[PDB]
Design an enzyme around this catalytic site. Structure first.
Site, PDB file in Angstrom:
ATOM      1  N   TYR A   1       5.699  54.841 -37.346  1.00 58.40           N
ATOM      2  CA  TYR A   1       6.954  54.262 -36.868  1.00 58.40           C
ATOM      3  C   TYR A   1       7.751  55.261 -36.023  1.00 58.40           C
ATOM      4  CZ  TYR A   1      11.341  52.011 -36.223  1.00 58.40           C
ATOM      5  OH  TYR A   1      12.448  51.432 -35.638  1.00 58.40           O
TER       6      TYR A   1
ATOM      7  N   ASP B   1      -1.006  54.496 -40.852  1.00 57.69           N
ATOM      8  CA  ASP B   1      -0.113  53.473 -41.424  1.00 57.69           C
ATOM      9  C   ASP B   1       0.720  52.806 -40.323  1.00 57.69           C
ATOM     10  OD1 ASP B   1       2.772  52.777 -42.803  1.00 57.69           O
ATOM     11  OD2 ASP B   1       1.114  52.429 -44.213  1.00 57.69           O
TER      12      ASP B   1
ATOM     13  N   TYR C   1       6.552  47.341 -36.529  1.00 60.60           N
ATOM     14  CA  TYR C   1       6.741  48.577 -35.776  1.00 60.60           C
ATOM     15  C   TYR C   1       6.573  48.402 -34.265  1.00 60.60           C
ATOM     16  CZ  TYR C   1       6.066  50.595 -40.498  1.00 60.60           C
ATOM     17  OH  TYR C   1       6.115  50.889 -41.839  1.00 60.60           O
TER      18      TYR C   1
ATOM     19  N   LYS D   1       0.897  45.510 -42.273  1.00 58.63           N
ATOM     20  CA  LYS D   1       1.740  44.872 -43.278  1.00 58.63           C
ATOM     21  C   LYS D   1       2.194  43.508 -42.770  1.00 58.63           C
ATOM     22  CE  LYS D   1       3.672  49.549 -44.353  1.00 58.63           C
ATOM     23  NZ  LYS D   1       3.643  50.354 -43.086  1.00 58.63           N
TER      24      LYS D   1
ATOM     25  N   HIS E   1       5.004  43.575 -46.776  1.00 56.74           N
ATOM     26  CA  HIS E   1       5.906  44.663 -46.382  1.00 56.74           C
ATOM     27  C   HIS E   1       7.093  44.767 -47.335  1.00 56.74           C
ATOM     28  CE1 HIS E   1       7.025  47.131 -42.559  1.00 56.74           C
ATOM     29  NE2 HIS E   1       7.614  47.671 -43.619  1.00 56.74           N
TER      30      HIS E   1
ATOM     31  N   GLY F   1      11.834  63.087 -46.050  1.00 56.71           N
ATOM     32  CA  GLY F   1      13.264  62.876 -46.069  1.00 56.71           C
ATOM     33  C   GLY F   1      13.767  61.862 -45.078  1.00 56.71           C
TER      34      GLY F   1
ATOM     35  N   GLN G   1      13.540  59.763 -41.089  1.00 55.11           N
ATOM     36  CA  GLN G   1      13.885  60.183 -39.734  1.00 55.11           C
ATOM     37  C   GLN G   1      15.392  60.257 -39.529  1.00 55.11           C
ATOM     38  OE1 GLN G   1      11.276  58.563 -36.635  1.00 55.11           O
ATOM     39  NE2 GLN G   1      10.040  57.483 -38.167  1.00 55.11           N
TER      40      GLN G   1
HETATM   41  N1  LIG Z   1       6.902  50.396 -46.308  1.00 60.14           N
HETATM   42  C1  LIG Z   1       8.113  50.653 -45.699  1.00 60.14           C
HETATM   43  O1  LIG Z   1       9.023  49.815 -45.787  1.00 60.14           O
HETATM   44  C2  LIG Z   1       8.313  51.939 -44.989  1.00 60.14           C
HETATM   45  C3  LIG Z   1       9.615  52.497 -44.797  1.00 60.14           C
HETATM   46  C4  LIG Z   1       9.729  53.703 -44.127  1.00 60.14           C
HETATM   47  C5  LIG Z   1       8.609  54.356 -43.664  1.00 60.14           C
HETATM   48  N2  LIG Z   1       7.336  53.797 -43.853  1.00 60.14           N
HETATM   49  C6  LIG Z   1       6.092  54.484 -43.340  1.00 60.14           C
HETATM   50  O2  LIG Z   1       6.099  55.842 -43.731  1.00 60.14           O
HETATM   51  C7  LIG Z   1       6.065  56.649 -42.530  1.00 60.14           C
HETATM   52  C8  LIG Z   1       6.796  58.007 -42.677  1.00 60.14           C
HETATM   53  O3  LIG Z   1       8.003  57.866 -43.346  1.00 60.14           O
HETATM   54  P1  LIG Z   1       9.321  58.181 -42.248  1.00 60.14           P
HETATM   55  O4  LIG Z   1       9.090  57.409 -41.020  1.00 60.14           O
HETATM   56  O5  LIG Z   1      10.462  57.875 -43.130  1.00 60.14           O
HETATM   57  O6  LIG Z   1       9.312  59.740 -41.803  1.00 60.14           O
HETATM   58  P2  LIG Z   1       8.945  61.027 -42.733  1.00 60.14           P
HETATM   59  O7  LIG Z   1       7.454  61.018 -42.874  1.00 60.14           O
HETATM   60  O8  LIG Z   1       9.921  61.107 -43.959  1.00 60.14           O
HETATM   61  O9  LIG Z   1       9.085  62.367 -41.755  1.00 60.14           O
HETATM   62  C9  LIG Z   1      10.396  62.352 -41.256  1.00 60.14           C
HETATM   63  C10 LIG Z   1      10.507  63.465 -40.176  1.00 60.14           C
HETATM   64  O10 LIG Z   1       9.827  64.623 -40.560  1.00 60.14           O
HETATM   65  C11 LIG Z   1       9.584  65.365 -39.321  1.00 60.14           C
HETATM   66  N3  LIG Z   1       8.450  66.244 -39.589  1.00 60.14           N
HETATM   67  C12 LIG Z   1       7.095  65.872 -39.755  1.00 60.14           C
HETATM   68  N4  LIG Z   1       6.307  66.933 -40.064  1.00 60.14           N
HETATM   69  C13 LIG Z   1       7.189  68.041 -40.086  1.00 60.14           C
HETATM   70  C14 LIG Z   1       6.993  69.418 -40.330  1.00 60.14           C
HETATM   71  N5  LIG Z   1       5.742  69.930 -40.616  1.00 60.14           N
HETATM   72  N6  LIG Z   1       8.037  70.298 -40.314  1.00 60.14           N
HETATM   73  C15 LIG Z   1       9.266  69.756 -40.022  1.00 60.14           C
HETATM   74  N7  LIG Z   1       9.616  68.477 -39.771  1.00 60.14           N
HETATM   75  C16 LIG Z   1       8.530  67.624 -39.812  1.00 60.14           C
HETATM   76  C17 LIG Z   1       9.308  64.283 -38.209  1.00 60.14           C
HETATM   77  O11 LIG Z   1       9.976  64.604 -37.072  1.00 60.14           O
HETATM   78  P3  LIG Z   1       9.077  64.912 -35.563  1.00 60.14           P
HETATM   79  O12 LIG Z   1       8.518  63.523 -35.244  1.00 60.14           O
HETATM   80  O13 LIG Z   1      10.074  65.531 -34.607  1.00 60.14           O
HETATM   81  O14 LIG Z   1       7.980  65.777 -36.167  1.00 60.14           O
HETATM   82  C18 LIG Z   1       9.854  62.966 -38.883  1.00 60.14           C
HETATM   83  O15 LIG Z   1      10.844  62.377 -38.101  1.00 60.14           O
HETATM   84  C19 LIG Z   1       6.693  55.779 -41.402  1.00 60.14           C
HETATM   85  O16 LIG Z   1       6.325  56.282 -40.114  1.00 60.14           O
HETATM   86  C20 LIG Z   1       6.039  54.449 -41.725  1.00 60.14           C
HETATM   87  O17 LIG Z   1       4.695  54.426 -41.329  1.00 60.14           O
HETATM   88  C21 LIG Z   1       7.199  52.605 -44.519  1.00 60.14           C
HETATM   89  C1  LIG Z   2      14.407  55.889 -45.986  1.00 59.98           C
HETATM   90  O1  LIG Z   2      14.251  54.503 -46.087  1.00 59.98           O
HETATM   91  C2  LIG Z   2      13.866  53.841 -44.902  1.00 59.98           C
HETATM   92  C3  LIG Z   2      13.435  52.523 -44.965  1.00 59.98           C
HETATM   93  C4  LIG Z   2      13.062  51.871 -43.809  1.00 59.98           C
HETATM   94  C5  LIG Z   2      13.089  52.498 -42.565  1.00 59.98           C
HETATM   95  C6  LIG Z   2      12.640  51.746 -41.289  1.00 59.98           C
HETATM   96  N1  LIG Z   2      11.213  51.537 -41.477  1.00 59.98           N
HETATM   97  N2  LIG Z   2      10.256  52.332 -41.033  1.00 59.98           N
HETATM   98  N3  LIG Z   2       9.082  51.883 -41.415  1.00 59.98           N
HETATM   99  C7  LIG Z   2       9.265  50.760 -42.125  1.00 59.98           C
HETATM  100  O2  LIG Z   2       8.271  49.991 -42.705  1.00 59.98           O
HETATM  101  C8  LIG Z   2      10.670  50.524 -42.158  1.00 59.98           C
HETATM  102  C9  LIG Z   2      11.411  49.400 -42.863  1.00 59.98           C
HETATM  103  O3  LIG Z   2      12.360  48.891 -42.376  1.00 59.98           O
HETATM  104  N4  LIG Z   2      10.931  48.982 -44.152  1.00 59.98           N
HETATM  105  C10 LIG Z   2      11.640  47.946 -44.857  1.00 59.98           C
HETATM  106  C11 LIG Z   2      11.858  46.699 -44.305  1.00 59.98           C
HETATM  107  C12 LIG Z   2      12.554  45.753 -45.032  1.00 59.98           C
HETATM  108  C13 LIG Z   2      13.019  46.067 -46.293  1.00 59.98           C
HETATM  109  C14 LIG Z   2      12.809  47.320 -46.842  1.00 59.98           C
HETATM  110  C15 LIG Z   2      13.318  47.653 -48.252  1.00 59.98           C
HETATM  111  F1  LIG Z   2      12.620  46.877 -49.133  1.00 59.98           F
HETATM  112  F2  LIG Z   2      13.092  48.957 -48.542  1.00 59.98           F
HETATM  113  F3  LIG Z   2      14.655  47.433 -48.371  1.00 59.98           F
HETATM  114  C16 LIG Z   2      12.116  48.269 -46.121  1.00 59.98           C
HETATM  115  C17 LIG Z   2      13.511  53.823 -42.510  1.00 59.98           C
HETATM  116  C18 LIG Z   2      13.904  54.484 -43.673  1.00 59.98           C
END
Ligand SMILES: NC(=O)c1ccc[n+]([C@@H]2O[C@H](COP(=O)([O-])OP(=O)(O)OC[C@H]3O[C@@H](n4cnc5c(N)ncnc54)[C@H](OP(=O)(O)O)[C@@H]3O)[C@@H](O)[C@H]2O)c1
Ligand SMILES: COc1ccc(Cn2nnc(O)c2C(=O)Nc2cccc(C(F)(F)F)c2)cc1
Ligand SMILES: NC(=O)c1ccc[n+]([C@@H]2O[C@H](COP(=O)([O-])OP(=O)(O)OC[C@H]3O[C@@H](n4cnc5c(N)ncnc54)[C@H](OP(=O)(O)O)[C@@H]3O)[C@@H](O)[C@H]2O)c1
Ligand SMILES: COc1ccc(Cn2nnc(O)c2C(=O)Nc2cccc(C(F)(F)F)c2)cc1
Lengths: 314, 314
Positions: free
Chosen positions: B19, B45, B50, B79, B112, B215, B217
């Protein structure tokens, strides 16, 4: 200083906590409650569970009789124990507490806990395996009986303890509700500061009363020894050196500046006298923000033995 | 390394998060997904939400065609978005995702989110005032349609995301269940480590997959800019110096050593390559305990706008 309750009565903002474990001889409750009043406490927190109402009541009566205070100066709290939730048992339970304490009325009567237990002689009724037997009671009918104790003049105000947001609204949405709870007494300290519940109570004009505000007595029957010690926290200590006070005084003053009525238990003469210094100093907004950041949703009470209960608050 | 799913398939324990917010050109998703595979990620993933399945699928196709990997080396996740929960929409949603990515199957398809939304042309259908229109769907019927996707070979495994314990059990206790969820992908990091949900998932042979494990984005549209920056946490910085790594690598290894499958988003070529270093070192049992102590129940996503949904997971 006092806060006005939503039924017109006034509650002193610092209260004295009287629970001591069975190792502590019962005579100590008499001595220390007298010392608490002499030091300046006017809010006195007890309960049927604590097995000390006879001695706490005797301390209050003696300080009235020796001419230090009048009954109207003292705010005394008791609590309805959880084997007495069935509504025909509520008023007899309160009259029993009054007889033991030798008082005509309590200033505050609380539902001690939302988790009803089987009626009977035992305080913690258990089966063959030491499992605690639950009872199924509609707490809105307990509340009805509580309201009758108010109209009878046996309790000036009534409130609840250990209720979550969902259980509070079950009382606020009671058909025919006559009296809101004036307070919700719950565990509250910088590691579990209840900000979300506090704002909800503020929105409904319900006082939040903090117990275990100094981090609990860490009794091993209910508190995990490996939990961190609140009064050893490094931020609390830093602020204690800053203001030249103590970590306990910082923790108590934190609650007052966020609108929380705070209890403090001590059976030590010098610490009892120290805790009333909470009215003597003031934390800055930046101090308050640093305490805010210690929140961990860590509750010291190992209630996990009782998560089976339908009314489990956590 | 891989973990064995309860359906016999295998999932690489480190995954690449794809994402990026709309301000990042879509071309970058193609470029950085190729870089992730080249550096050694084999778990990718993505999701309908996205708006990048075309570019991510192209990156995977490019790395197979140029000889770097076979299709069986890549574990690809998509998803089902919340507007397609009604069972007649579930297979068509997957077929559309496969067409956009030009793949014959996904290794993993997830619900999702449990919060069903009104079907239609918007990701988030809203009405005249700005409130997002909810939908009332038995998620058990959604799961039955997910099971028919695995039977057809369009998804090798199926799972859920952002489910709490009660929502998982409603699926596990469904009459006639054919396939359990292989995983629950949830927000998980040292400030919100999900120890209790983790234990429950282990007890049912469901894998916990961590997102926002670095942590988040810290997008201003979703995340309060006042929350603490996980990667600047002093405990993580100190362990980083001990093992001669980085805070991010400490946070990712923390998950691997407690049995959690961990995602890592990065659109930076150096950080993408650094993140595969998680397989190179270890944390001591004392290290793990100090990270355990950071747990605050802080979830970064400001989802309170949706607290009124019957299936709100918090
Ligand atoms: N199921 C859901 O609802 C849901 C919700 C949120 C996320 N997700 C999935 O989980 C994935 C990751 O979670 P996230 O998007 O919240 O981001 P994250 O993985 O928590 O990483 C956040 C930040 O860490 C930085 N980073 C990465 N490697 C690093 C390193 N070695 N040292 C320092 N900083 C570093 C990146 O910035 P740079 O890009 O500048 O490296 C990124 O913006 C998403 O991309 C998505 O695929 C799913
Ligand atoms: C740190 O928490 C974060 C959660 C989401 C994002 C944005 N994002 N990035 N990738 C993804 O899949 C998503 C995303 O919106 N998921 C989602 C969609 C609907 C409901 C829910 C929940 F059930 F959790 F309320 C989550 C960023 C950060
Ligand atoms: N509604 C409920 O379910 C519930 C539950 C728990 C408690 N309560 C009420 O709340 C009261 C207090 O809560 P608590 O019993 O958890 O204890 P607490 O108030 O959290 O204080 C606990 C400990 O702090 C120590 N202490 C007191 N003043 C101090 C100071 N100035 N400097 C350093 N240490 C100090 C005391 O030890 P020393 O005695 O040795 O000073 C005491 O054991 C109880 O007594 C009871 O009335 C209600
Ligand atoms: C730090 O947490 C602590 C909790 C209790 C104690 C002992 N104790 N001392 N004074 C009291 O009133 C009590 C007491 O047992 N309360 C209680 C009774 C039944 C149910 C519940 C709850 F709803 F929480 F499960 C609480 C000490 C510390």
């Amino acid at each position: 200083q006092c806060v006005k309750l939503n039924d017109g009565h006034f509650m002193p903002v610092l209260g004295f906590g009287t629970y001591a474990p069975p190792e502590v001889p019962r005579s100590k409750a008499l001595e220390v409650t007298k010392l608490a009043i002499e030091a300046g406490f006017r809010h006195i927190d007890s309960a049927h569970l604590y097995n000390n109402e006879e001695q706490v009541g005797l301390a209050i009566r003696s300080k009235i009789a020796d001419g230090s205070v009048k009954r109207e100066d003292i705010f005394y709290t008791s609590k309805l124990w959880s084997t007495f939730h069935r509504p025909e048992l509520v008023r007899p339970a309160l009259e029993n507490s009054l007889k033991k304490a030798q008082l005509d009325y309590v200033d505050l009567y609380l539902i001690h806990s939302p988790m009803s237990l089987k009626p009977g002689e035992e305080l913690s009724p258990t089966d063959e395996n030491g499992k605690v037997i639950f009872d199924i009671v509609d707490l809105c009918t307990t509340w009805e009986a509580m309201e009758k104790c108010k109209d009878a003049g046996l309790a000036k105000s009534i409130g609840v303890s250990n209720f979550n947001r969902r259980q509070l609204e079950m009382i606020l949405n009671k058909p025919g509700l006559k009296y809101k709870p004036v307070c919700n007494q719950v565990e509250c300290h910088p590691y579990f500061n209840r900000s979300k519940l506090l704002d909800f109570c503020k929105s409904k004009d319900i006082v939040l009363v903090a117990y275990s505000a100094l981090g609990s007595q860490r009794d091993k029957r209910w508190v995990d020894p490996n939990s961190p010690v609140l009064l050893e926290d490094p931020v609390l200590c830093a602020l204690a050196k800053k203001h030249k006070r103590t970590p306990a005084l910082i923790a108590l003053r934190y609650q007052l500046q966020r609108g929380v009525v705070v209890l403090a238990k001590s059976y030590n003469e010098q610490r009892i006298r120290q805790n009333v210094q909470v009215f003597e100093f003031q934390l800055t907004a930046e101090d308050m923000k640093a305490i805010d950041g210690l929140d961990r949703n860590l509750h010291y009470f190992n209630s996990d033995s009782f998560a089976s209960h339908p009314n489990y608050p956590y």
